[PDB]
Homo-oligomer: A and B are copies of this chain.
Amino acid sequence: VPFIRSLLMPTTGPASIPDDTLEKHTLRSETSTYNLTVGDTGSGLIVFFPGFPGSIVGAHYTLQGNGNYKFDQMLLTAQNLPASYNYCRLVSRSLTVRSSTLPGGVYALNGTINAVTFQGSLSELTDVSYNGLMSATANINDKIGNVLVGEGVTVLSLPTSYDLGYVRLGDPIPAIGLDPKMVATCDSSDRPRVYTITAADDYQFSSQYQPGGVTITLFSANIDAITSLSVGGELVFRTSVHGLVLGATIYLIGFDGTTVITRAVAANNGLTTGTDNLMPFNLVIPTNEITQPITSIKLEIVTSKSGGQAGDQMSWSARGSLAVTIHGGNYPGALRPVTLVAYERVATGSVVTVAGVSNFELIPNPELAKNLVTEYGRFDPGAMNYTKLILSERDRLGIKTVWPTREYTDFREYFM
């Protein structure tokens, strides 16, 4: 199989990427099939990650009668690739979302589907409404709407960059601990994404005494992460009021608005009058701690007078800047291409079928590398020129990321 046949038809089989990265690799093709349950209202959202160089394929949210989503599950791949490999590159990936059949006591089909390929991460999108998804790209090919749910949609992953290094999968390293639930893994680390935040710039705080403390929210921003991340920096406090106790806690909010993790940074911190008081941030959040994708981050601060009753107005001022380092974030395909597929009002008690094939290039771990042979790529000259020509004339040929399924069928029949 050539490379353009594997790129335009990912269900054919894997081909090596023809480029300058020559390395001993194996070609493996993967599958992932789901019967995910429609919620009570009938509607929800599917967040694909085309381009992700690993086993994570996407997430599932269910829209409810309040109007806010609820996380169902992370859509994964059949084989746990970090359990048996170390490095990875995505050759191609295709998905298909259809609800073409009835449940037991239902005599009619319901449902329509919108789908877009937004060219940024998931927190960058303004409208997540059913109607407002269509205004996320200006391209005719990257979006389609009012598709019947019985026909379905087909997601095709087009290349974001070539000449990419191999990316380290989240694989466990051998380790011994007294904790039985001790996990030590080697994360993805090349090409990170760093968000800087100037939290306060000599911000003055004035709020009178309340017994138990006064809790405020300093800021709230929009980060993006599926994998491990860190937080570093300092906030510097000044005061004139004797005996204050400061507590701060970092929150990492999911896409559905609920709290994923919580981390107390300062516990029982004592101010000093006439001296600047500094608290550090040293957070490392591992990969397993993160269940659903992270859309926001929030710092809230709790202040309390040390035994001052009926008075003691307790002001302070703060200055400082922190940083959030997403490990492996700017690798093209980790976060920056997203595809949202929003089905609306399917019949209750019914299922939505997601099925796909993902073609990889791997390097095995030392337990498997003694049994499995790796070769260099089976070259052929002039495959990269033909690939670049097809990608350059993509508007004329009609090649697109998001199709309806009959168009991908007769395009596949015309291409074969």
Given contacts A220-B177, A221-B173, contact A351 B111 (CB under 8 A): yes
Q: How far is the CA of A277 from the CA of B185 in the complex (A)?
A: 26
Contact yes or no, B277 A268, CB < 8 A:
yes
Contact B22 A161 (CB under 8 A): yes
Asked whether, in the complex, the Cβ of B228 is within 8 Å of the Cβ of A126, the reply is no
Contact of A189 among B191, B205, B216 (CB under 8 A): B191
Contacts of A214 in B (CB 8 A): none
Residue of B nearest to A103 (CB): B108
Main secondary structure of the interface of A (DSSP, over half): loop
Chain B residue contacts of A205, Cβ below 8 A: 178
CB proximity of A114 to chain B, nearest CB, Å? 6
Q: Which residues of B contact A277 (CB under 8 A)?
A: 267-268
Asked if residues B278 and A33 are in contact (CB atoms below 8 Å), the reply is no
Cross-chain contact B136 with A369 (CB below 8 angstroms): yes
- Minimum CB–CB distance from A354 to chain B (whole Å) comes to 10
What separation, in Å, do the CA atoms of A177 and B218 have in the docked complex? 6
A411: interface (CB < 8 Å): no
Interface 9-mer from A252-260, A374-382, A402-410 = A374-382
> Is the beta-carbon distance between B100 and A102 smaller than 8 angstroms?
no
Digitize A298-338: 1 where CB-to-B-CB distance is under 8 Å, 0 elsewhere: 00000000000000000000000111010101101000000
**Which B residues are CB-close (under 8 A) to A160?**
22-23
Task: Assess the A194–B189 pair: CB atoms within 8 A.
Answer: yes
Interface contact B272-A384, CB-CB below 8 Å: no
1/0 per residue, CB under 8 A from B, across A113-139: the answer is: 010001110011110001110111111
Q: A28-43 toward B: CB 8 Å interface, digit per residue (1/0)?
A: 0011111100000000
B135 in contact with A78 (CB, 8 Å): yes
Across the interface, A200 reaches (CB within 8 A) one of B139, B174, B179, B219, namely B179
Given contacts A23-B161, A233-B282, 5 further A-B contacts (CB under 8 A): A19-B163, A100-B148, A110-B351, A163-B163, A371-B372
- Return 12 A-B CB contacts under 8 Å, by A number: A21-B161, A101-B109, A103-B108, A124-B366, A168-B193, A178-B200, A186-B194, A187-B194, A196-B228, A264-B278, A268-B277, A372-B372
